[PDB]
């Protein structure tokens, strides 16, 4: 695996611990605002997700979790990270700030040999497992796995559009809070409401989930949009997705096709459950999506509203590595 | 005036305070299960609206705010308590047991002349202030004011409908926790999900309100149907209706329509903003719903999702007196 | 084991839930309230703890876990259900009413064997594991495990009281949410503030706690009392003891005889961190309570501020399985 | 009055909004980071405190708030403000940055008068109004009024002190969130547990409130020191005092001392009560600190615990003005 992380941000953290429980080997990590002694507190104590198991310690200017030796950095500019000294082949760019392949490549000059960006990106290819793995090559240097909502609406948009067709659709996403909020009324120039305190506010913000879905599924391109919903719980969100099918169908043929997909091509991508689940049942969660079958409703045979819940954090790091092993699968192929 | 409350639960309370603050005269309170020292308590404080200014006290096996003096009953069957005595002619029935016309006209047989049902009624004819109110007439003895979420929405499409048609409907409301819910999770047999802890959960709820609509706006009978998601926020909440209309029209139309209405025929009843608000903007804020202009988004020329919030609790009330002033105009006219 | 449980809230499906883990066998459960379907769903599903694991399903008018049969009893009265049929002889008293030796005691006429009452009794013996173990006798036929916020003070007391000795403490107790408090203002008669919405609100609370302590360490008992204060988190309490000793010390003093106990004579029972601890970092914790170092203060040799972490929940319910393991090694004894 | 307030977070907008209520003039506001049209926002709505009545508006480069007009600058640094220019003399220095006297003057080089630091100064005398403002004198030119929390701890403390003296006393401040707060686990190397999910966490931080009460009550210097508990509440604080006092007496002489105080030379300052009242019965509040009577409790004759509630934006903000009252009355004298 060779894995490199640079950032130790909500996705970077993360992800290491889901690199660690998956199998996968991470050799380095980046960070120049993160002190050493800091990280392995910040990666053993978890809110969210509870206390990491393992034994996570400092051991002569390296991390060392169960035994693993990860070599951390802490350089400022992309282009200045050593990653081939530590052996660092496939760079997890999750610093937020360095998404667009001009950027990107900076970690290239370091000896990288590959980069994903663990965010959207304006000109970086964009994949979801499950919906269009297909589309990968070697040649690719730099890549984009989309967001955490894209990843929960594109398997759910796939299944519903190659069994009935998606005339058009609009969604709403019930959100979790986000790191990029405020505890109390405080200031956000660029998003007025979402510096509104997250404790007490239900705050409307906006997506580009639904129009990065017609990047990865080309037939939806401009058929779809919508925005969030913040709302004060500390994670797990809800996709809200009301559309118009082109083909004529019963509640039941929609449940149908998502069992089927979820026990088949979209295994461990895309759940299925008709319990009377709630957000919390999700924690932990490592599908991109799960349909929530009992929740969803519809008005006729062709107007219907669909739910599916997703652990915006986890499930999201989940597929990062997914991604990673189906591209060296490809690459060292 | 002469109105009396039969329950004192958060709809009867807040009536009480908001008639109080609008001039209305409640004489009567009746209520089996709470005593008249704790009524002044439960007045007097409240967590979500403020401490009440006046001043609160019992006297005499009355209760006297701000010198009104308010007599108490403690009865526990409808057809017991003696309204006649306190001199109480419009019964606000809003002990969610007693909603249909059959058991509602219990309050007749005390002396009661009228009857308004705070909560959907299976058989009263129910009303929404600046949508159907002129299909009141005197005989009728029980009414109801429809629930919290069909005055929001009711409004909303009334305005979509006569402007652009609306041809079929999903609606879906983030609402705020209810009384009926769990602290934590607890045994809840008819609504399984509805137990579950409601400050760390994101719970699908149903409601009835869509279908309702149907009621108050004959046309949109079996044309709009939703769901709720219940969420961490103690007041207010939005509704999100995405909908398809006949005329073809761009999202100004629809802000325009919706300003129109706001300034006049629905003045008082709906609101307007283009305000980057949040969910506290709209506590105490007595509208039935307000339009929130930049929330909105429009896919296509007909296919359009519109967002408005309401004070689920204050407003609702606010519309209960409104109900009451009216009926009496057509009445002791 | 042959463990019986008389109701299935948040401490009756919790236990279970901890026997299972902990190997211990359940063969009964006894709730009039809750059908057997709704048993599998509120057990596989808890918002604070997770989904459990394993496989729950009905079979027969039992409920199965992994394998384990269960037979479920509806009951009313507790003089009716028939454990001895099950097999049942320790039964665990977790339903809050019958918490009286005298009441207790109808488990008897059933066939019970002993039985442990999982909160405080006004005469039943209570017991603290680590702390008054040594009490027990075989001639106890009905034990109280006192309550949660005890079984965190009273290992604390223990330590600072054996070794410096405790002149006199007021306690205060920063307590996450329960079962028993209101989303939103309700009627609690009882509790006036206790029915304020719990979601909103620090709500002052009694507490027994100390008192009781006086009743597990003899010594102790009127010399320490202290009340609650409820806070708006789902899970995980802390106990804030401030206490005049009897002999001069450091803190450090009091670090080294709590860090000695936790890793000897309480161990299991008394945990110790020097780490920058919260809330969440003890959910699903198991010991009783744990010593945050950094936490307390000390403002003289002989007035010192202490802090002890315990989820309220979680740690609880593995007590009440370590009492009966120790009563019944004393018993078939 | 001619004031000025540098920096606007939520001290300095809340010092502004309480101005206009109680009737001062503040001419001129500072701030480099929030645009004029951003503070028309940020003051006219308010999730805590609700929306502000009168009409606010940009006005030429100019705020206008009900007719005053409050000129904006936008200087990065202290010493390049034209306070003079606006004609503003006393300066609410409310910036969190420029806290000791040798810094907070660089005020003076901009024509400013005196200066007011609204939070705990290392050098600059420390004033509790109520407590020692008979300490003023015109020749101090830099000043602070403490913090919240003092506000709240030193009323109580003098007047358990003056009464029954306080020979030593350990303070637990359950405080709400904060600014400095994360809605979610990130960055605070500052203070590791103030980093962690705020609204999942009940965070124990650290206090200067009760050693500043060493310099506002002399006598009490090095008798009493504390530290705090953050919880998930948007807004009021309560405060813990254990206190050993040196005088024997029973919990109702505290009492008494307490109403008798509140009545007479701390009213307005200090407030009495004895109703079940909870966190949010205090929003809005406008005393530094309010005794709750039922909730605290008493050990022994010399060891007790009092309560006192406080709303920490509100109350300092009002003791704001209040100081900068006197100061004018003894200056301008
Ligand atoms: N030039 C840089 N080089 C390296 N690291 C950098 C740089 N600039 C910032 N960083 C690091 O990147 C991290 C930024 O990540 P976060 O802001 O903490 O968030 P992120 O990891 O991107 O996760 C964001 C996600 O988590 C959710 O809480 C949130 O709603 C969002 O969806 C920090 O730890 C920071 O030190
Ligand atoms: N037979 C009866 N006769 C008279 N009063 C009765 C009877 N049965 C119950 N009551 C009283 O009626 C009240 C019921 O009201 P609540 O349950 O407190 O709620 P309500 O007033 O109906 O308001 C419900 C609304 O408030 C929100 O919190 C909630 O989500 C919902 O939208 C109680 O105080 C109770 O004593
Ligand atoms: N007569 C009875 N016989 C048998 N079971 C009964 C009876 N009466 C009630 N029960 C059952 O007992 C249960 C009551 O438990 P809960 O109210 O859910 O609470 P408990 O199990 O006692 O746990 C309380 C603890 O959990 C926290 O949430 C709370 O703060 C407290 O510390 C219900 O499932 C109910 O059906
Ligand atoms: N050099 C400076 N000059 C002028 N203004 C400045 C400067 N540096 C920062 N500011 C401004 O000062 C404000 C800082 O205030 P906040 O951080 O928002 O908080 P404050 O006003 O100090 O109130 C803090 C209090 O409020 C509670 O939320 C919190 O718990 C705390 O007790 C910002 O709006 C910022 O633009």
Request: glycine fraction near 10%; hydrophobic fraction near 40%; aromatic fraction near 8%.
């Given at each position: 695996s060779k894995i490199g992380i640079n950032g130790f941000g909500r996705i970077g953290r993360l992800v290491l611990r889901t690199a660690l429980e998956m199998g996968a080997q991470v050799v380095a990590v980046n960070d120049p605002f993160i002190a050493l002694e800091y990280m392995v507190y910040m990666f053993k104590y978890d809110s969210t997700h509870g206390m990491f198991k393992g034994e996570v310690k400092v051991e002569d200017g390296a991390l060392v979790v169960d035994g693993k030796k990860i070599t951390v950095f802490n350089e400022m500019k992309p282009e200045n990270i050593p990653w081939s000294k530590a052996g660092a082949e496939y760079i997890v760019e999750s610093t937020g700030v360095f998404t667009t392949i001009e950027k990107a490549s900076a970690h290239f000059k370091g000896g990288?040999?590959?980069?994903?960006i663990?965010?959207?990106?304006?000109?970086?290819?964009?994949?979801?497992?499950?919906?269009?793995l297909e589309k990968?090559?070697?040649?690719?240097?730099?890549?984009?796995?989309?967001?955490?909502?894209?990843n929960c609406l594109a398997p759910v948009a796939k299944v519903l559009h190659e069994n009935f067709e998606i005339v058009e659709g609009?969604?709403?996403?019930?959100?979790?809070?986000?790191?990029?909020?405020?505890?109390?009324?405080?200031?956000?120039?660029?998003?007025?409401?979402?510096?509104?305190?997250?404790?007490?506010?239900?705050?409307?913000?906006?997506?580009?989930?639904?129009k990065a879905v017609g990047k990865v599924i080309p037939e939806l391109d401009g058929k779809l949009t919508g925005m969030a919903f913040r709302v004060p719980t500390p994670?797990?969100?809800?996709?809200?997705?009301t559309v118009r099918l082109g083909k004529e169908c019963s509640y039941d043929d929609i449940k149908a096709a998502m069992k089927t997909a979820s026990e088949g091509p979209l295994q461990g991508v895309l759940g299925y459950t008709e319990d009377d689940v709630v957000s919390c049942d999700f924690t932990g969660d490592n599908r991109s999506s799960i349909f929530d079958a009992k929740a969803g409703i519809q008005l006729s045979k062709t107007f219907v509203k669909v739910v599916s819940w997703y652990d915006n954090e986890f499930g999201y790091s989940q597929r990062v590595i997914d991604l990673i092993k189906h591209m060296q699968?490809?690459?060292?192929?």
């Amino acid at each position: 695996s060779k894995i490199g992380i640079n950032g130790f941000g909500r996705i970077g953290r993360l992800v290491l611990r889901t690199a660690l429980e998956m199998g996968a080997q991470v050799v380095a990590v980046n960070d120049p605002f993160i002190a050493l002694e800091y990280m392995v507190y910040m990666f053993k104590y978890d809110s969210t997700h509870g206390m990491f198991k393992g034994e996570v310690k400092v051991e002569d200017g390296a991390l060392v979790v169960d035994g693993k030796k990860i070599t951390v950095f802490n350089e400022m500019k992309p282009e200045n990270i050593p990653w081939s000294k530590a052996g660092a082949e496939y760079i997890v760019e999750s610093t937020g700030v360095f998404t667009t392949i001009e950027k990107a490549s900076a970690h290239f000059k370091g000896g990288a040999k590959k980069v994903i960006i663990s965010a959207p990106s304006a000109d970086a290819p964009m994949f979801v497992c499950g919906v269009n793995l297909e589309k990968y090559s070697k040649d690719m240097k730099v890549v984009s796995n989309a967001s955490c909502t894209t990843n929960c609406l594109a398997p759910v948009a796939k299944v519903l559009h190659e069994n009935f067709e998606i005339v058009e659709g609009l969604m709403t996403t019930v959100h979790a809070v986000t790191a990029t909020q405020k505890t109390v009324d405080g200031p956000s120039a660029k998003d007025w409401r979402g510096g509104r305190g997250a404790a007490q506010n239900i705050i409307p913000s906006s997506t580009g989930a639904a129009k990065a879905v017609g990047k990865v599924i080309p037939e939806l391109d401009g058929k779809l949009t919508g925005m969030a919903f913040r709302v004060p719980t500390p994670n797990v969100s809800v996709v809200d997705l009301t559309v118009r099918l082109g083909k004529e169908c019963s509640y039941d043929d929609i449940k149908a096709a998502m069992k089927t997909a979820s026990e088949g091509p979209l295994q461990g991508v895309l759940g299925y459950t008709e319990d009377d689940v709630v957000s919390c049942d999700f924690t932990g969660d490592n599908r991109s999506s799960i349909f929530d079958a009992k929740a969803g409703i519809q008005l006729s045979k062709t107007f219907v509203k669909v739910v599916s819940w997703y652990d915006n954090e986890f499930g999201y790091s989940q597929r990062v590595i997914d991604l990673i092993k189906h591209m060296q699968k490809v690459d060292s192929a």
